């Protein structure tokens, strides 16, 4: 359906903007507040925009040298030729961080290609379905903040521990994928507590 | 030349 297609695409873009804003990337306020009719106005979708045209490039606030692509595929299952096109465009623009949606699934050979080409080109598959909602806004998920290495070492020295002793967070879980953190990262999680007010924990990515 | 001999000496 064309109407629900534009509604889905608008919420997709909104969730993407909220995501990379949470990742510290440079996101303008208007795209964070972009509405459905505004999403129509900037561009009906089916047999009219494109998943290649909808793709966006965002800069990192901390480091303007770093940029992140968000791609969308025009095909149901992303094929190796599309991965080749995306990574070659990344090579032409000298970028390594790229996010790629999938309409309903990914070819397993493309999964192998993703994990094989990871260090030279960091790619993350992402379901359209899971991307339809910003899961971070749920009531059950507490507030997550990615820690940096100085914070990690100062915490570890403050408690005289090792990375082994901390509680873990599986890297495949959707919140880590939302933040895009890798193995070795550690996330500070602030949550409300009905016996102390606030509670801070630290989860090591694995 | 000295440094390469030093390398091959580390390999042995």
């Amino acid at each position: 359906d064309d109407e629900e297609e534009t509604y889905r695409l608008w919420k997709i873009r909104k969730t993407i903007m909220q995501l990379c804003h949470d990742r510290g990337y440079l996101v303008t306020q208007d795209e964070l507040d972009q509405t459905l009719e505004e999403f129509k106005a900037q561009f009906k979708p089916s047999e009219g925009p494109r998943r290649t045209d909808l793709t966006v490039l965002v800069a990192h606030n901390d480091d303007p040298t770093d940029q992140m692509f968000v791609f969308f595929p025009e095909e149901p299952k992303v094929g190796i030729k599309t991965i080749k096109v995306y990574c070659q465009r990344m090579q032409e623009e000298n970028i390594t961080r790229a996010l790629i949606v999938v309409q309903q699934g990914m070819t397993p050979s493309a999964k192998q290609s993703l994990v094989d080409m990871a260090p030279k080109y960091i790619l993350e598959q992402f379901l359209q379905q899971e991307l339809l909602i910003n899961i971070t806004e749920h009531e059950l998920v507490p507030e997550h903040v990615v820690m940096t290495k100085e914070e990690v070492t100062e915490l570890l020295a403050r408690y005289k521990l090792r990375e082994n002793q901390l509680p873990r967070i599986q890297a495949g879980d959707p919140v880590a994928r939302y933040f895009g953190i890798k193995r070795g990262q550690v996330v500070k999680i602030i949550r409300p507590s009905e016996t102390a007010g606030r509670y801070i924990t630290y989860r090591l990515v694995q | 030349e000295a440094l390469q001999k030093k390398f091959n000496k580390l390999k042995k």
């Binding site: 480091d63 303007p64 040298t65 | 000295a2 440094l3 390469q4 030093k6 390398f7 000496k9 580390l10």
Partner: protein, 232 residues
Amino acid sequence: HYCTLRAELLMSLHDLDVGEICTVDPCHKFTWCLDACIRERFVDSKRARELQGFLDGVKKGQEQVLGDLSMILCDPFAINTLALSTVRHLQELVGQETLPRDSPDLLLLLRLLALGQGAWDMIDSQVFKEPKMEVELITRFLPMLMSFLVDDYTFNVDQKLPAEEKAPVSYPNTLPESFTKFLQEQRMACEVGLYYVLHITKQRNKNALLRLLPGLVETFGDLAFGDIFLHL
């Protein structure tokens, strides 16, 4: 120190996001990389390529910014960044069996550090020409650092190999004095040697430490007797 404040002022303006000054200062795009490197205290190859492009983007008739860049590169924390990047590059190149002449990224580091160290010369007289490098730094000084390092590692591998007989040979503690000649004739070779001394002090190998402790007594511009290396 004033030069550091200059860079800080620019980044503070960048923190304020004033396009009236961000879009007119051509060293703003340079200081993107300078901030991203000085926070890391290391120049990765990506930001190195970016700095190379910014140097290559300087056209004729507007070369005064090079002086500003040298001024901006005269920041002592940037000297620390470049010197440690050179030292760690030379530390990791021994494993790959690559000479300093076979290291274009390292050559770019030498270029940038040479342009940085002559900053006060470029403000004293409006010099907009690049300072030149030393052949013997590429071929004698840095390979002498590698010579010391890889003798130390060969001794270490021998120690980790059993069956050493009584009265083993010590690590060679004789000092080639052309190394010290370059220390006491080239401020470039001098400061990178000082940071090498600090790095091996972190490695805390007494043999090479007291091997090279002679010759540091006489050094160029009293840089071995300056505030930076003494404090470190």
